Scaffold this motif. Structure first.
Motif, PDB file in Angstrom:
ATOM      1  N   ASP A  54       0.821  -1.245   0.000  1.00 39.26           N
ATOM      2  CA  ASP A  54       0.000   0.000   0.000  1.00 39.26           C
ATOM      3  C   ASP A  54       0.810   1.228   0.000  1.00 39.26           C
ATOM      4  O   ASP A  54       0.228   2.371  -0.244  1.00 39.26           O
ATOM      5  CB  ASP A  54      -0.941   0.050   1.298  1.00 39.26           C
ATOM      6  N   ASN A  55       2.125   1.149   0.250  1.00 37.69           N
ATOM      7  CA  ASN A  55       2.933   2.354   0.426  1.00 37.69           C
ATOM      8  C   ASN A  55       4.158   2.539  -0.568  1.00 37.69           C
ATOM      9  O   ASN A  55       5.204   3.144  -0.251  1.00 37.69           O
ATOM     10  CB  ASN A  55       3.519   2.409   1.857  1.00 37.69           C
ATOM     11  N   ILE A  56       3.933   1.988  -1.786  1.00 38.57           N
ATOM     12  CA  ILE A  56       5.017   1.992  -2.835  1.00 38.57           C
ATOM     13  C   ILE A  56       4.907   3.075  -3.860  1.00 38.57           C
ATOM     14  O   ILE A  56       5.758   3.208  -4.761  1.00 38.57           O
ATOM     15  CB  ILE A  56       5.098   0.633  -3.537  1.00 38.57           C
ATOM     16  N   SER A  57       3.900   3.953  -3.802  1.00 41.83           N
ATOM     17  CA  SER A  57       3.626   4.874  -4.869  1.00 41.83           C
ATOM     18  C   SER A  57       4.621   5.972  -5.121  1.00 41.83           C
ATOM     19  O   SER A  57       4.662   6.630  -6.130  1.00 41.83           O
ATOM     20  CB  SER A  57       2.235   5.544  -4.837  1.00 41.83           C
ATOM     21  N   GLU A  58       5.442   6.252  -4.050  1.00 45.17           N
ATOM     22  CA  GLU A  58       6.413   7.294  -4.112  1.00 45.17           C
ATOM     23  C   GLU A  58       7.807   6.862  -4.573  1.00 45.17           C
ATOM     24  O   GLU A  58       8.732   7.686  -4.731  1.00 45.17           O
ATOM     25  CB  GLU A  58       6.579   8.057  -2.749  1.00 45.17           C
ATOM     26  N   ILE A  59       8.016   5.557  -4.817  1.00 44.50           N
ATOM     27  CA  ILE A  59       9.231   5.064  -5.504  1.00 44.50           C
ATOM     28  C   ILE A  59       9.373   5.842  -6.826  1.00 44.50           C
ATOM     29  O   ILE A  59       8.312   6.074  -7.533  1.00 44.50           O
ATOM     30  CB  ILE A  59       9.123   3.587  -5.761  1.00 44.50           C
ATOM     31  N   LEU A  60      10.542   6.282  -7.232  1.00 43.56           N
ATOM     32  CA  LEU A  60      10.771   6.987  -8.475  1.00 43.56           C
ATOM     33  C   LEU A  60      11.322   6.034  -9.539  1.00 43.56           C
ATOM     34  O   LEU A  60      12.234   5.227  -9.266  1.00 43.56           O
ATOM     35  CB  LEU A  60      11.769   8.146  -8.302  1.00 43.56           C
TER      36      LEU A  60
HETATM   37 MG    MG Z   1       6.566   4.937  -1.770  1.00 43.53          MG
END
Ligand code: MG
Ligand code: OGA
Ligand code: NI
Ligand code: ZN
Length: 331
Positions: A54-60
């Motif tokens: 749930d918390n992977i969206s900010e990986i670039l």
């Molecule tokens: Mg993230």
């Protein structure tokens, strides 16, 4: 001889059997798994890679790659056009857009038909080759960031200490993103875990038949073959299952789903495609059996293949005659 037809084998280790990674690879090989070039490993039901995604969206994704094809539907090359950076949340929204999303389909076979018919007419964007890991540090079994390193294996087998490190890579995919026909650097193993999302379809040639695929590739890509004696190291050529069957090349296929591992074995040529938005993690590894494949691996010296820092030592120690020419290619 075990697995003489070189079929892809599927394994279901127990939680006890999942403790010792090296021992389980050796077991799979005792059953003939390597003859296929590829095996699937379904983890025990008790195991998990991490608690949630749930918390992977900010990986670039610093350098998303637009995969542009040239050729005919069953025989094509792809080049990678670099795009502007985007986050995993931005890339997921893009993958799900009307322009890029998976089409309606009946089943995996219908989707495979649509891939081969239509791939060349689109240019999907692949978030490939991102250094990092999604395994929780507390996951002790089959954690691709905690494997024994290839440098340590070379040192254990051969006695020579070398520089270099061995870390995992993340792959964020979408419909039609494609991995071209290749073996690993220095004909290493690979292991790939599909963390989340839509499936990945694989094609593989048994290692004992790899040179049959190479000879077909030289016929089908004749300018590339004149350019380089190991041009499949460039990782740009695609050949469909229909074309392989027409030319008598032995191969197998399988679809990997989220939660499953795949292992590729030394000198097992593989290629494939993603069904929709997904995230995979993969790394190279070695065993004692790899050493002889590493000593014999082809190499690109034309300059195109350009690879990691840690491959230097493998060439220098295992292939000293080739070293000088290969290094010229790297510089
Ligand atoms: Mg993230
Ligand atoms: O997942 C991909 O795009 C490509 N992966 C591999 O070639 C591998 O895991 O060996
Ligand atoms: Ni690979
Ligand atoms: Zn080359």
């Amino acid at each position: 001889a075990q697995n003489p037809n070189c079929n892809i084998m599927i394994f279901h280790p127990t939680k006890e059997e999942f403790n010792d990674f090296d021992k389980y690879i050796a077991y799979m090989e005792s059953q003939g798994a390597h003859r296929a070039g590829l095996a699937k490993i379904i983890p025990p039901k008790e195991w998990k890679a991490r608690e949630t995604y749930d918390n992977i969206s900010e990986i670039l994704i610093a350098t998303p790659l637009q995969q542009v094809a040239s050729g005919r539907a069953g025989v094509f090359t792809q080049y990678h056009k670099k795009k502007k950076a985007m986050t995993v949340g931005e890339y997921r929204h893009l993958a799900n857009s009307k322009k890029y999303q998976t089409p309606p389909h009946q089943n995996f076979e219908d989707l495979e038909r649509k891939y081969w018919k239509n791939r060349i007419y689109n240019s999907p964007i692949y978030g490939a080759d991102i250094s990092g890991s999604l395994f929780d540090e507390n996951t002790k079994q089959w954690n691709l960031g905690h494997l024994g390193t290839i440098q340590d294996l070379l040192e254990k087998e051969c006695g020579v200490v070398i520089e270099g490190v061995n870390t995992p890579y993340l792959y964020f995919g979408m419909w039609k993103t494609t991995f071209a026909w290749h073996t690993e650097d220095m004909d290493l193993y690979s292991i790939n875990y599909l963390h989340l999302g839509e499936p990945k379809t694989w094609y593989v040639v048994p290692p004992e038949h790899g040179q049959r695929l190479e000879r077909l590739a030289r016929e089908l890509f004749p300018g590339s073959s004149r350019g380089c004696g190991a041009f499949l190291r460039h990782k740009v050529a695609l050949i469909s299952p229909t074309v392989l069957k027409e030319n008598g090349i032995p191969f197998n296929r399988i679809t990997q789903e989220a939660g499953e591992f795949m292992v590729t074995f030394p000198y097992g040529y593989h290629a494939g495609f993603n069904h929709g938005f997904n995230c995979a993690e993969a790394i190279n590894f070695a065993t004692p059996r790899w050493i002889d494949y590493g000593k014999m691996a082809s190499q690109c010296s034309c300059g195109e293949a350009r690879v990691t820092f840690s491959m230097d030592a493998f060439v220098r120690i295992l292939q000293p005659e080739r070293y000088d020419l290969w290094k010229r290619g790297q510089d």
